[PDB]
Design a protein around this ligand. Structure first.
Ligand code: HEM
Ligand code: HEM
Ligand SMILES: Nc1ccc2ccc(CCNCCCc3cccc(F)c3)cc2n1
Ligand SMILES: Nc1ccc2ccc(CCNCCCc3cccc(F)c3)cc2n1
Ligand SMILES: C[C@H](O)[C@H](O)[C@H]1CNc2nc(N)[nH]c(=O)c2N1
Ligand SMILES: C[C@H](O)[C@H](O)[C@H]1CNc2nc(N)[nH]c(=O)c2N1
Ligand SMILES: [Cl-]
Ligand SMILES: [Cl-]
Lengths: 362, 362
């Protein structure tokens, strides 16, 4: 059944891919080559072109992503050649550097060798390449709660966090054949962070908030034409609400709204005062302001939604069906102020695509 | 097939209803009585108890409603006895008075005679008993755009609006047998309106905004045990976001955010300033403030969500399955600040319930 599933996904992918790339007549020969390779090796190897385009289609198909207008400009790095843990490390280090691009973020994906027969060649443990540790001990809560289990897993491996609220986690990943993952501290020179300040309210600095510049999601599986690239970190730039409305605002994350209300000088006593709403708005304004001031790419939810509307228009005029997840596309602040809120989306899954996969710890 | 559909809905309703009311042993006899009545008349008549409880269950089952905690305290008025257009008018007038209750709003439903064989006895044309007219002529836009087609329909019937932005529409409904609906101007003494002012910003009055006190939805069908009550207006009190975030804020409604930004003294030039978000928050604070100050019942979205959480807890501990529409339950401002955003809901349709029905005009 395995080979059959593979062959079928391969037929659909190559057809679609070669048609978009204006290479329709090359399908028959390529598919034959593929058919033999599968019969003879149990799998097949993508050309540079297939891989690059498949990663772009995968982005284009991510129902939950509001930033898809720019799918065709994704920078794809092919690292299917790595074999050593040192090579993986340096490739991950490089990804951070070139994606960050001194603040002018380039949307980038680095692709590692794919699974063979469900056997991972490289297994990344980080949720993001850059993320803060979290600690929960005897009622004492430090840093990012979403990182608690990974942090505890790293502290099994010989690492120890300084237990500030903003400890950078080390890169952690396992190689095929090894029993335990390895870990490498991030070079601080590679990581841009942004201090959160407010355009009008000087006291906002008293909160001593900051966040990292580039979200590099590193735990999802890229699937292209039946080939499972479990290790393929990618990044865009942030939409401000991700930081200001969720990461810093959620009760199960940094939970800062009460502190925000205090520094902006409003009471946090009565629901009818809408103090949480006001606090959210000022925190989100501060995040956008701080990133711009630091010269680090970011988008506000309004601009982002107008871009996504263009993505919609582009999809129709190219004759492609649009898919989306309304519940994730709407932004967590002022959603009714965007067009997204007022239309519906088909949530069907189209491949290529990025998928959740089981965590190697927990 | 009609009688069969009816009988089946009746069996399920009476079973459930009599069980909740601790009257389980009275089911067999009641169902027999019902079975004969259907065979002999083509339909059946609900007892006072069945009707009252069925209207409450219908509210309890409205997936899209965040205010369901108070389903069991619904005030049900039985007007199945009306036969004249004067009687309907006075019943609608009465509903407004007793629901308004001098500002201490009582959630109320008035139930009129149900359809016979799809034949409506009374057919209400208003979306709400109290709502503002809308006009769109030669690029000139006045009042509430959502009311444009009903307003044009009324102005066919001999009525004429003053073309202020806040013209009260007359009640309009048709009686079985009549070809045209009739219309009656609302007595101004019965309608509470609230001027919108802001707690801190005196200039907010310059906008001369106002809204009506009681939303009385009058175009939905109540379905109870196979009986179709097409005419059954009901009301709660407002959640502030309904007014501040949608009615006054939407581009296809009153579209006031640019004006709001101006009076609160912020520029409306750059998306990154989040001026729409700030404007939404101040407008929503003003709406809550104005209603409280006027002594008219209203709830903020936070309190409302905490109440709905209690509804959820109550549903489980009573062994009832919970149903809901996540896309409508989340409030249109700061949705991620409520628990609703972070859980999922089953959107299955359970009867009794309230349903959309086709409009008699357009
Ligand atoms: C260029 C700037 C980009 C922006 C502003 C953007 C924006 C977003 C946002 C706000 C989310 C929701 C995040 C959350 O609520 O947790 C999202 C989801 C997602 N984005 Fe993007 N994105 C961008 C680029 C990319 C790129 C380059 C890829 C991959 C090539 C990608 C793939 C996805 C996927 C797979 C999800 C859903 C993840 C999940 O289900 O957990 N996006 N995007
Ligand atoms: C007591 C105060 C109440 C509050 C605060 C409340 C709140 C809400 C809100 C905010 C909505 C969404 C409105 C929209 O976005 O258009 C809603 C929907 C709804 N509510 Fe309630 N509600 C209340 C009482 C009631 C009552 C008394 C009933 C009927 C007996 C009811 C039945 C419904 C129904 C049927 C909907 C959905 C209508 C549709 O699909 O268009 N609610 N409620
Ligand atoms: N700005 C961007 C760009 C690309 C992105 C790509 C992916 C994401 C998702 C980040 N958070 C995903 C959380 C996944 C998850 C789902 C359920 C439970 C859980 F613990 C974690 C955000 C992005 N933001
Ligand atoms: N505060 C309350 C209480 C009860 C309510 C009961 C119902 C409602 C819904 C009011 N707006 C419904 C709009 C229905 C609709 C749907 C699609 C298209 C359309 F034109 C109209 C609001 C309520 N608000
Ligand atoms: C397509 C989408 O379901 C539609 O825009 C809904 C979204 N959720 C909503 N929620 C509420 N309360 N009211 C609405 O009118 C809508 N509109
Ligand atoms: C149950 C619900 O789908 C869940 O809370 C979702 C809602 N929409 C979301 N949307 C985004 N962008 N991010 C999220 O984490 C979530 N959480
Ligand atoms: Cl993030
Ligand atoms: Cl309304």
């Amino acid at each position: 059944e395995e080979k059959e599933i593979l062959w079928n996904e391969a037929k659909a992918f190559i057809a679609a891919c070669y048609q978009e790339l204006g290479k329709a007549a090359e399908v028959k020969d390529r598919l034959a080559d593929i058919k033999s390779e599968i019969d003879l090796t149990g799998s097949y190897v993508h050309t540079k072109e297939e891989l690059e385009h498949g990663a772009k289609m995968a982005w284009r198909n991510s129902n939950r992503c509001i930033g898809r207008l720019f799918w065709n400009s994704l920078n794809v790095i092919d690292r299917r050649d790595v074999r050593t843990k040192e090579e993986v490390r340096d490739a991950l280090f490089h990804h951070i550097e070139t994606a960050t691009n001194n603040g002018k973020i380039r949307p980038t994906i680095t692709i590692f060798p794919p699974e063979e027969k469900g056997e991972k060649q490289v297994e990344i443990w980080n949720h993001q390449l850059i993320r803060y540790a979290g600690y929960e001990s005897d009622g004492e809560r430090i840093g990012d709660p979403a990182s608690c289990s990974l942090t505890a897993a790293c502290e099994e491996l010989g690492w120890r966090g300084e237990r500030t609220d903003f400890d950078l986690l080390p890169l952690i990943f396992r190689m095929k054949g090894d029993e335990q993952p390895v870990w490498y501290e991030l070079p601080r020179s590679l990581v841009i962070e942004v201090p959160i300040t407010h355009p009008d309210i000087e006291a906002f600095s008293d909160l001593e908030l900051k966040w990292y510049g580039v979200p590099i999601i590193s735990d999802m599986k890229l699937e292209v034409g039946g080939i499972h690239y479990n290790a393929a970190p990618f990044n865009g730039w942030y939409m401000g609400t991700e930081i200001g409305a969720r990461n810093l605002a959620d009760e199960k994350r940094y939970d800062k709204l009460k502190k925000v209300a205090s520094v902006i000088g409003i009471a946090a006593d009565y629901n009818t005062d809408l103090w949480k709403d006001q606090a959210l708005v000022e925190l989100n304004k501060a995040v956008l302001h701080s990133y711009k001031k630091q010269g680090v790419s970011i988008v506000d939810h309004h601009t982002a939604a107008s871009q996504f509307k263009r993505f919609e228009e582009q999809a129709e005029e190219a004759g492609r069906k649009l898919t989306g997840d309304w519940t994730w596309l709407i932004p967590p602040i002022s959603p009714a102020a965007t067009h997204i809120f007022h239309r519906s989306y088909d949530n069907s899954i189209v491949k290529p695509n990025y998928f959740y996969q089981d965590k190697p710890y927990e």
